[PDB]
């Protein structure tokens, strides 16, 4: 990259109708249960999950990398207890992008104790362009975006030791 700068786009506390709190001990900080730092896990608030919306019009003068995710539960029980509803959907749209994802509820082998999964997707939001998040559940929202620039590409090297 020529330039890479992490900026806040959809602040954690902007969701007044949902629960920004939440995580598991599979992702643990100081023994306490936690979650991905730059991500927000939207659950139900007041025993109700009204459709969560969010948008960001890009003005940082650069192209922006934005990452989101959806939750694939292990069973109907966690689907109901967390997002209050079944038959939910996650919708992300920009000028170029139109992507819709659904929760896939099924029992899977345990990885870090969980049978559930979190599937992430990403995009490059152009300058002066808006992004639109819209979900009735299972959305794992970005709190941050990444300004980016490229003069050209490179590679990834495995060494195990010492930059001099």
């Amino acid at each position, epitope marked *: 990259v020529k330039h890479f700068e992490k900026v806040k786009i959809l602040p954690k506390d902007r969701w007044t109708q949902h*629960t920004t*709190t*939440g*995580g*598991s*001990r*599979a992702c643990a900080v100081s023994g306490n*249960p936690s979650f991905f730092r730059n991500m927000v896990w939207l*659950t*139900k*608030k*007041g*025993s109700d999950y009204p459709v969560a919306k969010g948008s960001y019009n890009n003005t940082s003068g650069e192209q922006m990398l934005i990452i989101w995710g959806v939750h694939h*539960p*292990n*069973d*109907e*029980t*966690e689907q*109901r*207890t*967390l997002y209050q509803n079944v038959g939910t959907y996650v919708s992300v749209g920009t000028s170029t992008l139109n992507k819709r994802s659904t929760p896939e509820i099924a*029992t899977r082998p*345990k990885v870090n*104790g*969980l*049978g*559930s999964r979190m599937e992430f997707s990403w995009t490059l939001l152009d300058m002066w362009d808006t992004i639109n998040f819209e979900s009735t559940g299972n959305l794992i929202a970005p709190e941050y975006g990444f300004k980016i620039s490229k003069r050209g590409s490179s590679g990834i090297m495995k060494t195990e030791g010492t930059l001099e």
Partner: antibody, heavy 112, light 109 residues
């Protein structure tokens, strides 16, 4: 792990109770406290449950709106409050914990 | 709306006569079934979960078995503390906290 609660409560009909449930041991509080009820001589019945991180607790169809469940993660204690009692509400109120961690599929009650 | 019925309601078995209990569900709860032991005047103790594997601190007389609609609980040689009430809990269909009425085991004479 020890879930310890208050014992022996005596209340008039039309009054409210609040049964505390303190969690001693290794407190995760990403784990779900479940409230179960047992009328004298009868079986067990799920009243609801709460997971402190996620907030927003569940209630069974029967005890919905007749009861409310809260939690203080700072005191490691979960409360089951019965608004407006009746003579038929005389029973034992257990607080249990589950295998925990939504997505594990282990929703048995391992502690009491 | 899973229905859980335990038969027999009461079981009469001698100390060491190998008591066997049975829980049956209206639909298939697959491999997810638990067994609890409640001794009179006390809270339930977790015995079996996943229909087969047994909880921590539980002696090996207690053996779970079965899958689908019909399950089973086995106690090889009974004991003093083993005369109580036993419940089965399904956990497949929401809500996963439906219970069975229970089976009461007493001393056969």
């Amino acid at each position: 792990v020890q879930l310890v609660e208050s014992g022996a409560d005596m209340k008039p009909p039309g009054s409210s109770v609040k049964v505390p449930c303190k969690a001693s041991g290794d407190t995760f509080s990403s784990y779900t406290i479940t409230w179960v009820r047992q009328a004298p001589g009868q079986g067990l019945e799920w009243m609801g449950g709460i997971t402190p991180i996620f907030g927003s607790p569940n209630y069974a169809q029967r005890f919905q709106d007749r009861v409310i469940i809260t939690a203080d993660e700072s005191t490691s204690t979960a409360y089951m409050e019965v608004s407006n009692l009746r003579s038929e509400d005389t029973a034992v109120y257990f607080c249990a914990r589950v295998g925990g961690e939504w997505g594990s599929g282990r929703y048995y009650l391992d502690h009491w | 709306d899973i229905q859980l019925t335990q038969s027999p309601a009461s079981l009469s078995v001698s100390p060491g006569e190998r008591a066997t209990l049975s829980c049956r569900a209206s639909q298939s709860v697959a491999g997810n079934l638990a067994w609890y032991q409640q001794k009179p005047g006390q809270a339930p103790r977790l015995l079996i979960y996943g229909a087969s594997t047994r909880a921590t601190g539980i002696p090996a007389r207690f053996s779970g078995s079965g899958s689908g609609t019909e399950f089973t609980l086995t106690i090889t040689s009974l004991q003093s503390e083993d005369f109580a009430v036993y419940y089965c809990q399904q956990y497949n269909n929401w809500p996963p906290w439906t219970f069975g009425q229970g089976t009461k085991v007493d001393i056969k004479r």
